[PDB]
């Protein structure tokens, strides 16, 4: 029948079946040879009955409206001539982004350990969010956005599913770019506790990491981020491989002051 | 006989249902009060013959 629900697999004994349904109701389950069990893998969601939890029909990964929304037009209209100073930082940046999007052979012939993303630290007002309004324009690719607190939500499985969607959505629709504006929220440190509110926050971060270390430098995503702070956030993000290349956006020198006003 | 009465009375009503607990907020006009079940929300009620 039609009224049925969704679940997520975790294992296969030995045919066999196990699930973690959405209602927080695990089931061990004798073998369903209904669907070909070799036609699926763990975390591959499936339909399932309401009373006799058994696999009934697979189904796709349908993303949430609060994520598709973050797909973007090219409403940004800000050329690199609209920005002053920072000929370096933009020069350093684009040697991580479009060339791996287009001209990665100079890496791939060498096959060097490639970079995955970026970071733009420094104080308020050096042109952080602006520059991402620019790079989304000039490049002929898509682009994405999410403030960090747009992730955190009340319910105890509201966030992690959100983030596994985006990166998965970005492996789809590829090649893509990610923007995380105020990473200072989630990325602080380990706030050790057993309370609800202390866990559901960080457990998002634990997904973000596994998402970064899940793909490779072959599929053509390229993430970045931003912050007003670096003496506050967790170095696990800064570990070699995840977010390695950095940018110390300074204050502007006095020559740069002449450009900005003009 | 009064022995077998008890155990046959007692056993009759361990089959009986549970019984909740709660606290009073105020009293509505008559034969009507309100309660909050101390973990959960509100439930207007009626009362019995005695009280």
């Amino acid at each position: 029948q039609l009224p049925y629900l969704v679940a997520n697999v975790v294992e296969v004994m030995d045919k066999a079946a196990v699930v973690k349904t959405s209602s927080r109701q695990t089931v061990f389950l004798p073998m369903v040879g209904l669907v070909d069990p070799d036609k699926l893998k763990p975390n591959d969601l499936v339909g399932v009955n309401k009373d006799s939890y058994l696999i009934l029909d697979t189904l796709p990964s349908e993303f949430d409206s609060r994520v598709k929304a973050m797909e973007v037009d090219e409403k940004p209209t800000e050329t690199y001539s609209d920005v002053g100073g920072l000929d370096k930082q933009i020069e350093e940046l684009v040697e991580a982004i479009v060339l791996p999007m287009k001209r990665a052979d100079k890496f791939k012939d060498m096959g060097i350990r490639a970079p995955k993303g970026a970071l733009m630290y420094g104080p308020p007002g050096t042109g952080k969010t602006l520059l991402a309004r620019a790079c989304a324009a000039q490049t002929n690719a898509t682009f994405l956005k999410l403030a960090a607190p747009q992730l955190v939500q009340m319910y105890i499985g509201e966030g992690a599913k959100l983030v596994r969607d985006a990166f998965a959505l970005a492996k789809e629709k590829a090649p893509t770019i990610i923007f995380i504006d105020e990473l200072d929220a989630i990325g602080t440190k380990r706030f050790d506790s057993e309370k609800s509110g202390d866990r559901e926050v960080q457990r998002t971060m634990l997904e973000l990491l596994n998402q970064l270390d899940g793909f490779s430098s072959d599929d053509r995503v390229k993430v970045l981020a931003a912050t007003n702070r670096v003496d506050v956030l967790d170095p696990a993000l800064l570990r070699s491989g995840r977010l390695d290349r950095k940018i110390e956006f300074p204050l502007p020198s006095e020559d740069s002051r002449a450009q900005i006003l003009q | 006989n009064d022995k077998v009465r008890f155990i046959k009375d007692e056993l009759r009503l361990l089959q009986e249902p549970g019984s909740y607990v709660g606290e009073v907020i105020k009293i509505v006009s008559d034969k009507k009060v309100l309660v909050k079940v101390q973990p959960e929300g509100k439930y207007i009620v009626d009362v019995a013959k005695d009280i």
């Binding site: 050790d192 506790s193 057993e194 309370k195 | -």
Partner: protein, 87 residues
């Protein structure tokens, strides 16, 4: 415990396990019954390693950066007896 039983019947064998400073959590920072995971997860560690008898077919290694942050409620006296810095 499964990580040891599996390790037992495949004797001899070595263990390695990093980020070991995570078992502490609260480390009974308040003694509330909400961190039972952060407490017991140290317990089952200790009770099991005491069960080896130290015969010579199973040994264990651990590591971190902050041994001054370690939990010497155990793992100091006779369990992780030999401490070894590195240059």
């Amino acid at each position: 415990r499964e990580m040891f039983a599996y390790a037992k019947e495949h004797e001899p064998c070595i263990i390695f396990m990093d980020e070991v400073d995570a078992i502490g959590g609260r480390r009974f920072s308040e003694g509330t019954s909400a961190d039972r995971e952060i407490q017991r997860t140290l317990m089952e560690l200790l009770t099991q390693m005491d069960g080896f008898d130290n015969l010579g077919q199973t040994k264990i290694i651990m590591a971190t950066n902050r041994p001054d942050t370690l939990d010497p409620a155990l793992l100091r006296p006779g369990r992780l007896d030999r401490k070894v810095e590195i240059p």
